[PDB]
Amino acid sequence: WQECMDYAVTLARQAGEVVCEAIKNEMNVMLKSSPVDLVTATDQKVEKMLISSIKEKYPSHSFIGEESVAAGEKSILTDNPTWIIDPIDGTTNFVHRFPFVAVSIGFAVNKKIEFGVVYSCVEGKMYTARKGKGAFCNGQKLQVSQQEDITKSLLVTELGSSRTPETVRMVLSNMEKLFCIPVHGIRSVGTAAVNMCLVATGGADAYYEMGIHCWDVAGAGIIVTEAGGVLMDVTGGPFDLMSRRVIAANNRILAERIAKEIQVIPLQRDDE
Amino acid sequence: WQECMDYAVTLARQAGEVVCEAIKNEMNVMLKSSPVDLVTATDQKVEKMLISSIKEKYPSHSFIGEESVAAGEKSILTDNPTWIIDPIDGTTNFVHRFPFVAVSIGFAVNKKIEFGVVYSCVEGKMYTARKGKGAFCNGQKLQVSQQEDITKSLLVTELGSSRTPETVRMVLSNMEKLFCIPVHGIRSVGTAAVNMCLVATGGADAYYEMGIHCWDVAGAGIIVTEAGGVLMDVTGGPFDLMSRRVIAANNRILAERIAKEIQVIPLQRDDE
Ligand SMILES: O=P([O-])([O-])O[C@@H]1[C@@H](O)[C@H](O)[C@@H](O)[C@H](O)[C@@H]1O
Numbered sequence A, B: 001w002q003e004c005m006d007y008a009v010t011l012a013r014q015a016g017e018v019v020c021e022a023i024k025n026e027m028n029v030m031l032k033s034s035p036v037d038l039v040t041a042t043d044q045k046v047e048k049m050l051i052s053s054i055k056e057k058y059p060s061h062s063f064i065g066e067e068s069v070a071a072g073e074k075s076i077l078t079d080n081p082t083w084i085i086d087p088i089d090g091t092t093n094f095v096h097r098f099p100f101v102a103v104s105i106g107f108a109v110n111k112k113i114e115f116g117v118v119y120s121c122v123e124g125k126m127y128t129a130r131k132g133k134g135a136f137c138n139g140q141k142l143q144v145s146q147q148e149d150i151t152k153s154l155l156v157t158e159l160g161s162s163r164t165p166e167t168v169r170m171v172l173s174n175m176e177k178l179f180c181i182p183v184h185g186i187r188s189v190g191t192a193a194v195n196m197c198l199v200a201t202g203g204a205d206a207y208y209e210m211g212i213h214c215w216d217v218a219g220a221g222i223i224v225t226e227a228g229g230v231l232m233d234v235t236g237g238p239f240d241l242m243s244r245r246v247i248a249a250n251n252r253i254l255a256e257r258i259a260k261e262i263q264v265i266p267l268q269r270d271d272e
C-alpha cells in the first residue's frame, strides 16, 4: 500500500494546487440539496481528475466520492480497496475565501482505513498517516494532547448543513450542555478534516459532530488515531464510518464524557 | 503619528516573537475571576515589556492594558494619546496551542483610533492600518467583501467567557436566529482581533460579539474600517469602544440586519 500512498500524496498536492488557484478567481456557485448546500465547478473537476488518475493505475479499485455519489453513484463500502475522496472539504469556506479548505483521500481495505492524506492548501500543510507508522504534518510527527479533564479542554465542532429547526435545536443544546460543564471553549473552522487534524496536532482536545459523511472524515480519522487519539461513535461504542456520527478525541476519557453528555440526532446513513 | 506607528509595528513583531516561542513550552496557567478566565506568565511578561518600551520613548502618553487593569489600573479613556494593548488576545488558544493568537495595539488621540497593529504570530501575519491610509497584511492591501445579501453571508462570533446560564442561553438563542435566516455559516477562531482581521480580508462578511473589552478590539477596528468596513454597536447605535459590544461588518446593510435580529445582553462598561 506504500506505493498507493506515495501516489496519493502526489495527487493531493496537484489537486491542492488547482483548489488554491481557483480560490482567488471568480466562481460558479451552484446548489445541491439546499440553498446552503453548495458546489462549484472546482469541486466537480477536481474529483474527476482524482478518480480518473487513480483508475488508470489501479483499475480494479473502488471509489466513494462526494460529487460522484451526488451524480447517482451509491456509497456502499465493501472489502475491496476503496478510495474515499472529498475533493473540497469546506466548500462554503472556499466560496467565501475563508482560509481553511482541505483535499481528503482515505484508503480502506476490508472496510478498515489503511492510510489517509489531508492537504490544507491555503496553509501549505500536508497531513499523512499510514496504519502502524505514525502521523505527520510536513514530515514532522504528530501527537494528541494529554488532557484528561473535560473542564480544562478545548473542543471543536460545527453547526452543520441542516436548517431544520428541531435538528438545529438539538445541535445548539448539545453545545450548551458541553459549554456549561464548563469546557475552556469551543471552536469551528469550517471543515471536519481540518478540525480533526487540529486534534491530531494537539491544538484541540476533541472534535464531535453528527451530520458529516464518510468522505469528510475517512482521511483525517487515521491521522488522529495514528497520532495517539481515538475514534468513537456518539453512543460511546465503536466508530462506524457510514453512520454520519463521529467523536475524535485525544483519549477515551474525554471521548466517553462527551458521548455521555450529548443527545443523538436521527440521520439517514451513508449506506441507506 | 507615523513614527509612533513604525515604532508600534516593531514592538508588536518583537513581542510576537516572545509569545510564539512561549507557546511551544509548558505554561503555568492561572485563573483570574473564573475557571475559564485564564492568564499565564507570558500575558503579563509581554504587557510589561510593551508598556516599558513605549513610555520609555513616549513619557507623556497614556496606556490601557488588560493585565494592568487586573492589577488595579482603571480603563478610562481621555483625549491624551493612549496606547490600548492586549499582550495576548486568544489566551485560551495560547494555553492549548490552538494556532490563532494575536498581539494587539491600538493608538487613540482625542478618543479616536489613529492606527492599529495586529500581529498573528503563529501565521506570521502582520495587519496594520492608519486612518485615511488603508489596511494591509504584510504589505498587501485589504478589502472587505461585497456581500449585501445576509442569506449568502458567512459570520464569525464567539461563545464568550461567561458561563452564566442566562447569558449563555442568550448567546445561543442569538446564534439560532441568525443561523436560521439562514446564513451560509458561522465560524469561531477564538480571538476577536483575528476574527475582525478575517472580516477585513474579505474571508468573512461580518463579526459580532457582546462581552469583549476595549483592548480586544482597539487594534482591529480601524483595520476593518480602512479595508472599507463599518463598526456599529449591537443596539444599532454608533460603535462605542467602552461599551463591551460590537458589530464589525463589510457594509451597513449587513450590520443593521444583524442588529435587528439579535437581542442585547446588559453589560458593565469598561469605563465603569
Ligand atoms: O460539504 P463539505 O464542505 O465538503 O463538508 C462539510 C464538513 O466538513 C463540515 O464538518 C460540516 O459541518 C458541513 O456541513 C459540511 O458537511
Ligand SMILES: O=P([O-])([O-])O[C@@H]1[C@@H](O)[C@H](O)[C@@H](O)[C@H](O)[C@@H]1O
Pocket (backbone or CB within 6 Å): B066, B086, B088, B089, B090, B091, B092, B158, B159, B160, B161, B190, B191, B192, B193, B209, B211, B212, B213, B216
Ligand atoms: O481574554 P482574551 O484572550 O484576551 O480575549 C478573548 C476575545 O478575543 C474573544 O473574542 C472572547 O470571546 C473571549 O471571551 C476573550 O475575551
Ligand SMILES: [Gd]
Pocket (backbone or CB within 6 Å): A043, A066, A086, A087, A088, A089, A090, A091
Ligand atoms: Gd466536499
Ligand SMILES: [Gd]
Pocket (backbone or CB within 6 Å): B066, B086, B087, B088, B089, B090, B091
Ligand atoms: Gd488577552
